[PDB]
Design an enzyme around this catalytic site. Structure first.
Site, PDB file in Angstrom:
ATOM      1  N   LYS A  53     -91.791   8.915  44.793  1.00 11.50           N
ATOM      2  CA  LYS A  53     -92.492  10.116  45.579  1.00 11.50           C
ATOM      3  C   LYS A  53     -91.197  11.140  45.621  1.00 11.50           C
ATOM      4  O   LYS A  53     -89.951  11.068  46.335  1.00 11.50           O
ATOM      5  CB  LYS A  53     -92.606   9.960  47.038  1.00 11.50           C
ATOM      6  CG  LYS A  53     -93.354  10.910  47.914  1.00 11.50           C
ATOM      7  CD  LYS A  53     -93.499  10.332  49.421  1.00 11.50           C
ATOM      8  CE  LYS A  53     -93.843  11.408  50.234  1.00 11.50           C
ATOM      9  NZ  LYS A  53     -93.895  10.930  51.670  1.00 11.50           N
TER      10      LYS A  53
ATOM     11  N   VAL B  89     -99.609  10.096  40.172  1.00 15.15           N
ATOM     12  CA  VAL B  89    -100.794   9.348  41.168  1.00 15.15           C
ATOM     13  C   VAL B  89    -101.564  10.047  42.308  1.00 15.15           C
ATOM     14  O   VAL B  89    -101.592   9.678  43.368  1.00 15.15           O
ATOM     15  CB  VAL B  89    -100.620   8.093  41.039  1.00 15.15           C
ATOM     16  CG1 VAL B  89    -100.623   7.277  39.719  1.00 15.15           C
ATOM     17  CG2 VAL B  89     -99.154   7.858  41.768  1.00 15.15           C
TER      18      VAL B  89
ATOM     19  N   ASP C   5     -97.139   6.144  55.968  1.00 11.80           N
ATOM     20  CA  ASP C   5     -97.453   7.838  56.393  1.00 11.80           C
ATOM     21  C   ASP C   5     -97.707   7.689  57.804  1.00 11.80           C
ATOM     22  O   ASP C   5     -98.871   7.808  58.306  1.00 11.80           O
ATOM     23  CB  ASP C   5     -98.679   7.939  55.582  1.00 11.80           C
ATOM     24  CG  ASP C   5     -98.200   8.562  54.243  1.00 11.80           C
ATOM     25  OD1 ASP C   5     -97.027   8.769  54.081  1.00 11.80           O
ATOM     26  OD2 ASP C   5     -99.016   8.956  53.481  1.00 11.80           O
TER      27      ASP C   5
ATOM     28  N   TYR D 146     -96.187  15.465  52.410  1.00 13.31           N
ATOM     29  CA  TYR D 146     -95.212  16.652  52.070  1.00 13.31           C
ATOM     30  C   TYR D 146     -94.350  16.275  50.499  1.00 13.31           C
ATOM     31  O   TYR D 146     -93.114  16.569  50.589  1.00 13.31           O
ATOM     32  CB  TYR D 146     -94.238  16.625  53.095  1.00 13.31           C
ATOM     33  CG  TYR D 146     -94.671  17.148  54.297  1.00 13.31           C
ATOM     34  CD1 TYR D 146     -95.125  18.624  54.609  1.00 13.31           C
ATOM     35  CD2 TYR D 146     -95.805  16.297  55.449  1.00 13.31           C
ATOM     36  CE1 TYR D 146     -95.876  18.985  55.655  1.00 13.31           C
ATOM     37  CE2 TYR D 146     -96.084  16.953  56.412  1.00 13.31           C
ATOM     38  CZ  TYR D 146     -96.159  18.214  56.659  1.00 13.31           C
ATOM     39  OH  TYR D 146     -97.048  18.634  57.695  1.00 13.31           O
TER      40      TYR D 146
END
Ligand SMILES: Nc1nccc(-c2c(-c3ccc(F)cc3)ncn2C2CCNCC2)n1
Lengths: 352, 18
Positions: free
Chosen positions: A51, A28, A166, A33
């Site tokens: 992630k 997705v 984030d 990073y």
């Protein structure tokens, strides 16, 4: 318990090695990073986002960035801020430790997607901004400054729920995949050029920019360079006094503004046509150049725009968050080793 | 002038893009 059974596959041109509890992996897109896959979790029965960090220990800068993200993510326990269901590595020892995976609840989209494929009602905006502010209260209470609130860093699902992620650095960059072009549009005048004089009030500016865009469907200050960005702002909030103009601008920029005629403050009720006057009023208290006169996350939760959702009892605060490590200068294996201690020490939420 | 998407007048869902 002890170590789960892992399995391997190829996604985004790299081996993903994950516990069997996570199935149907689907890419997705990218994260900070790293890059993120949707999955099903057979343990909890929820869909999750996983992630994988991309070469987390390739350099010092990156090793420290990896530590900083894990620490932060481990600490964030709040409904409107991305936190951790799981964190894992396929390594069985520090010596073979190279990869870091992070798992959270799956959110369907972010506000960038939403704003570019449907119109939002005032009700939609009320709840969405209510959520941003509520999380922001929590984040600010911990002496943390997000720095980079924008639509793409606010993840949402079909029920209209919202989570902030984030967190950004006090640093300007034009590096690849850092989101630098859009970040400029939501960034507070005081930190457009340098990070010498600022506080948490920068995020509330951002929020204001985001709210307007949710209301209209258009980016409020889509500037092309710092001069054009400052123009576009002043054109709405009026040219300020000379002391303040110099806090929030460069020599060159300041000269450009003065080569133009003084700009008056606009009445926000004439810009945002059709808006709920409560919506306009709040915008009027967020988007002000004087950061001290800017309404705070705490206060804004009590605004009448959110009468339907506000509840001072279910709007929690945070344990202040310890950022000392930031002062240390270490080696790759040194950061990588702190990153390992944190993987091992990780306790998951209860199964409800 | 930025006219709003849905004019104000006197449970919420969002459509996921794919
Ligand atoms: N689908 C989805 N759901 C929640 C989060 C993310 C996610 C993560 C991420 C972070 C931590 C974690 F542990 C797992 C995933 N990082 C960036 N994003 C997206 C958030 C904005 N859309 C694109 C990137 N993606």
């Amino acid at each position: 318990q002890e170590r789960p059974t892992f399995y391997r596959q190829e996604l985004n041109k790299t081996i993903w090695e994950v516990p069997e509890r996570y199935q149907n992996l689907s890419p997705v897109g990218s994260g900070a990073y790293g890059s993120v896959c949707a999955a099903f979790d057979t343990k909890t029965g929820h869909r999750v986002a996983v992630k994988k960090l991309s070469r987390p220990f390739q350099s010092i800068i990156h090793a420290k960035r990896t530590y900083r993200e894990l620490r932060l993510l481990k600490h964030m326990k709040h409904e409107n801020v991305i936190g951790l269901l799981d964190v894992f590595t396929p390594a069985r020892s520090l010596e073979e430790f190279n990869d870091v995976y992070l798992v959270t609840h799956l959110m369907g989209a972010d506000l960038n997607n939403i704003v570019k494929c449907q119109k939002l009602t005032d009700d939609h905006v009320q709840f969405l901004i209510y959520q941003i502010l509520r999380g922001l209260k929590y984040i600010h209470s911990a002496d943390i400054i997000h720095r980079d609130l924008k639509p793409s860093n606010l993840a949402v699902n079909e029920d209209c729920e919202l989570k902030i992620l984030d967190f950004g650095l006090a640093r300007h960059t034009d590096d690849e995949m850092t989101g630098y072009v859009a970040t400029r549009w939501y960034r507070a005048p005081e930190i457009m050029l340098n990070w010498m004089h600022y506080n948490q009030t920068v995020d509330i500016w951002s929020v204001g920019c985001i709210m307007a865009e949710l209301l209209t469907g258009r980016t409020l200050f889509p500037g092309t360079d710092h001069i054009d960005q400052l123009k576009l702002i002043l054109r709405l909030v009026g040219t300020p006094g000379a002391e303040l103009l110099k806090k929030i601008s460069s020599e060159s920029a300041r000269n450009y503004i003065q080569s133009l005629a003084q700009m008056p403050k606009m009445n926000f009720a004439n810009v945002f046509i059709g808006a709920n006057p409560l919506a306009v009023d709040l915008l009027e208290k967020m988007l002000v150049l004087d950061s001290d006169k800017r309404i705070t996350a705490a206060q804004a939760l009590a605004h009448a725009y959110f009468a339907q959702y506000h509840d001072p009892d279910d709007e929690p605060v945070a344990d202040p968050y310890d950022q000392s490590f930031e002062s240390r200068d270490l080696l790759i294996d040194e950061w990588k080793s702190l990153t390992y201690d944190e993987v091992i020490s990780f306790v998951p939420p209860p199964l409800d | 002038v930025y006219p709003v998407s849905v004019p104000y007048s006197s449970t919420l869902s969002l459509v996921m893009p794919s």
